[PDB]
Write a protein that binds this DNA or RNA. Sequence first.
RNA 1: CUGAUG
RNA 2: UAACUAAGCUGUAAAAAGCCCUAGUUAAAAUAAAAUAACCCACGAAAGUGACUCUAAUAAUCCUGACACACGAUAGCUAGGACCCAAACUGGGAUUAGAUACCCCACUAUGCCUAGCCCUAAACCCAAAUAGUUACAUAACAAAACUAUUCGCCAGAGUACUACUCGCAACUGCCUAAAACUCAAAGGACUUGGCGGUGCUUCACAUCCACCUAGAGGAGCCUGUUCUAUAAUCGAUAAA
RNA 3: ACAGGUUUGG
Lengths: 66, 137, 23, 86, 96, 208, 116
Amino acid sequence: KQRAIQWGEDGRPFHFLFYTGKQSYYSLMHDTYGKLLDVEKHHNQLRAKDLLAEKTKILKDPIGSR
Amino acid sequence: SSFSIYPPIPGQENSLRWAGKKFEEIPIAHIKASYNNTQIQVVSAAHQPLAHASCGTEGFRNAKKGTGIAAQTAGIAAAAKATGKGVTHVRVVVKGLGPGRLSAIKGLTMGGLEVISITDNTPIPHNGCRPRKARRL
Amino acid sequence: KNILKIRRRKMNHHKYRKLVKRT
Amino acid sequence: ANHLKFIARTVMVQEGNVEGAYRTLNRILTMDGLIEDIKRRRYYEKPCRRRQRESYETCRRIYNMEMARKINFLMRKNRADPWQGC
Amino acid sequence: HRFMEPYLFGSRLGQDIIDLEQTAAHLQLALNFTAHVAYREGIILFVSRHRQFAHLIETTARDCGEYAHTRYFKGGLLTNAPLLLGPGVRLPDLII
Amino acid sequence: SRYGPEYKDPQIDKEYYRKPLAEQTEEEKYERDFKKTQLIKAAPATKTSSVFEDPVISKFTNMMMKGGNKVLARSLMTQTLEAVKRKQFAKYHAASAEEQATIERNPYTIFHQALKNCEPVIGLVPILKGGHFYQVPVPLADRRRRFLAMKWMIAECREKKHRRVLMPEKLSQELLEAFHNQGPVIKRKHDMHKMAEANRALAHYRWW
Amino acid sequence: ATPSLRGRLARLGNPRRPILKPNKPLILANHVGERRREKGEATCITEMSVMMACWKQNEFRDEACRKEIQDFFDCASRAEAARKMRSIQENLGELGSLPPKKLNKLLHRFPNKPHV
RNA sequence: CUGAUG
RNA sequence: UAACUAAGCUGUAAAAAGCCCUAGUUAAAAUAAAAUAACCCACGAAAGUGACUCUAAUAAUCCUGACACACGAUAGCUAGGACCCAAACUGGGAUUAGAUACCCCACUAUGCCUAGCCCUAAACCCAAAUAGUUACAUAACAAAACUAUUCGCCAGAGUACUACUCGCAACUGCCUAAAACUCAAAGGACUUGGCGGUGCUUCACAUCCACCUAGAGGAGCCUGUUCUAUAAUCGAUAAA
RNA sequence: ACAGGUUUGG
Ligand SMILES: [Mg+2]
Ligand SMILES: [Mg+2]
Ligand SMILES: [Mg+2]
Ligand SMILES: [Mg+2]
Ligand SMILES: [Mg+2]
Ligand SMILES: [Mg+2]
Ligand SMILES: [Mg+2]
Ligand SMILES: [Mg+2]
Ligand SMILES: [Mg+2]
Ligand SMILES: [Mg+2]
Ligand SMILES: [Mg+2]
Ligand SMILES: [Mg+2]
Ligand SMILES: [Mg+2]
Ligand SMILES: [Mg+2]
Ligand SMILES: [Mg+2]
Ligand SMILES: [Mg+2]
Ligand SMILES: [Mg+2]
Ligand SMILES: [Mg+2]
Ligand SMILES: [Mg+2]
Ligand SMILES: [Mg+2]
Ligand SMILES: [Mg+2]
Ligand SMILES: [Mg+2]
Ligand SMILES: [Mg+2]
Ligand SMILES: [Mg+2]
Ligand SMILES: [Mg+2]
Ligand SMILES: [Mg+2]
Ligand SMILES: [Mg+2]
Ligand SMILES: [Mg+2]
Ligand SMILES: [Mg+2]
């Protein structure tokens, strides 16, 4: 199989990053950076309101997740 | 601990003594470090030679006396011949940039002489006599 | 490059000098 | 010869330290330019080579100074990239 | 740049100042030309390579429904489009 | 080479696991060592959980073994330990009550003390400079020092003995000499130290 | 500072004789020269001297003096640890010097513009 | 250190 | 040139030769040259000039302009003087098959001053002088492209910084400077390989060293080669 | 001259 249809009958590409070469990879990067900015602003608001209700979920030693 | 690396000029009223003597009475050790031989000669304060030992007089040969070990042995022998006459402190006068420059200096300390002043008296001609031509034509 | 013609003129002048010295 | 003895190019040791005093004396001559001067005067050089050596050293110093200036000017931008992934 | 002397107003101690009158006139013309293309169903591509507002430009393009490009610009993107994008593609009608 | 990079070294110490609750810092790593599903290599045939065997004895037997005949080196080590023990028992029974409180009889202790006495401190490294090799005095690692101390004794007991004197009999005397610091191994160590002291002036040639 | 450059090279607008004869065009390249095997010095020399002093004084025996034997091993261990930890710390940080592998990437971000 | 020719 | 000390000093990658009236230190005229300052760029028409001081002085109320006039680095000549040091040449000692060369020692003309010549250079900044411009405009490289008035040159290359002429204190010379003949090329820059006995960096997890094990070079035997010896195979015969 | 052939791995 191959890639599905990117643009409709009118020729307009469906995705908003079709002219970037990787409309999937760069979209994933953009969404990840957006979620990162959202988490950053949320944590900044929490620090300003003096609320620390989160934890560090980076230590994945007992889980073995790579 | 006010220590100045400048030599104690006799014109001042400084009080610096070595083995009871002043800086003007300390014997001198002329080390001529050429590119193929390193000579060491010990003279007194009155310019009277006390000990003389060179890499050639140390039993070396043409290319053997150019190494640093030859200068170190020459310094050991010079320090031995100097201590044979009862000397304690010495002022090293280095002359010429050669391979046995620092070896002949450390040779006196290894042979038992206290180095107090290292003076670099290298002949630097102010464009006097025309030196030899260049090699590798 | 130009050293070709330079050496050519050099050789010609050298041969002329040798001819003059011989005759 | 005619000048006073044990004044020019003289270094006094402290507490019998010989290696440090020798390194100080050597750095004195290197910063004054006597080591390279003696190494050059060992064999006579012609002015046709002297002018070339001076021009080469001047160009090299200019290029090195410009490179060091640009490095010190761009050292600020060595920090971690805050916009990674954009 | 030498082609900015007619587009500059002056220089305040080294820093140049742009003439906002001509700035606003050119901006009026540019916005009119941009609105007409979007009205006539024209593909608008915001091409801007700058790692400071790459997120803002992409969000603006997403909210507008037009396309964006703020990553490494490939060589034969617009020229060798029938080989980089697909068999037969529709090039952007306007580049911003 | 059959063990990939995900294979780690085994852990034979039984006491390391017989007290998992007595500590938390060691528990923190042992609770993840297996939860990471880490593969472990097979236990070697020469090393077990026996309390009478020692890794130093194992290393010395491995260095003494020629070729692949392991039982020969094992029997040689057994005879060496037996001769050491019997000579020390003879010296104990031929001594008085005052020397009985000082003369030891533990063969493992005598062997380890002899190795510690024969262990060098600083070695010589040949460095090429100016077209010639200079023996620079260099601090050696613990494994290097122990390996040299064992190899010197093994080589001396191999080459500097008579055909009628056996290896266990000769080593039983070499260990007792090294315990009192009067043997040729101590002599060679002191010669090495003297040759390093005579070259310490070349210590400025090292770059590490 | 930087030496003067006006009136040095051979140009049509220069009325005097050119002073500097550049071997190659004086254009600042976008990559620095690689350092010719940056080396380092030895360690624990003062600790080894006082260690061998015991051997020379007490006739080469370690049972006489011991602290000069233990401090030497401590210095060796600290040097062995610093040889491995700093070899990564100094390559991760950029407080002091830096290898040309990073200077080149720093210069390529803001290169020189010979044309236009 | 030196090493010529096709 | 004198005084103390030692049998050595200079000399190259290694030596030899040379000097042992040698070598170091303390003093020491005559001659030659003029460290750092100079990362300075000034003076002068050019060549050229930067150890200090003094006298004289560096044209044109300022265009270009010769075959006329006057200068013109080093090198060369003549006469007189000087000669520390370097050295054409020469004589030795190395290396090479050879080395009348690069390497080492000694030494001369010469480099030094006055007077008189010779008037040559890659005398190149290969970019002529006088007043300007950033307009059109990248053969290539290099120092970007150009205007108006001029002076002196340029007609394929070799033949040819040549012979024949004129002039010159120059006489193995300098300036000017062809022709017969031979060929259809001779030339500058550029792009890519190949090469370099010019460089820099990189690592080799049996690999170069720091280091470990067991081996060949010691004895005999087997076996395969290069050799002598016969009428008596041959191929392979550096990594491979 | 409306020109073309001819140098070179090109
Ligand atoms: Mg000819
Ligand atoms: Mg050039
Ligand atoms: Mg270059
Ligand atoms: Mg001889
Ligand atoms: Mg004289
Ligand atoms: Mg001068
Ligand atoms: Mg001028
Ligand atoms: Mg004037
Ligand atoms: Mg005129
Ligand atoms: Mg003469
Ligand atoms: Mg001479
Ligand atoms: Mg000769
Ligand atoms: Mg002359
Ligand atoms: Mg002249
Ligand atoms: Mg000139
Ligand atoms: Mg010309
Ligand atoms: Mg091109
Ligand atoms: Mg003219
Ligand atoms: Mg012709
Ligand atoms: Mg001529
Ligand atoms: Mg003629
Ligand atoms: Mg190997
Ligand atoms: Mg075998
Ligand atoms: Mg054999
Ligand atoms: Mg055989
Ligand atoms: Mg055969
Ligand atoms: Mg054959
Ligand atoms: Mg064949
Ligand atoms: Mg051609």
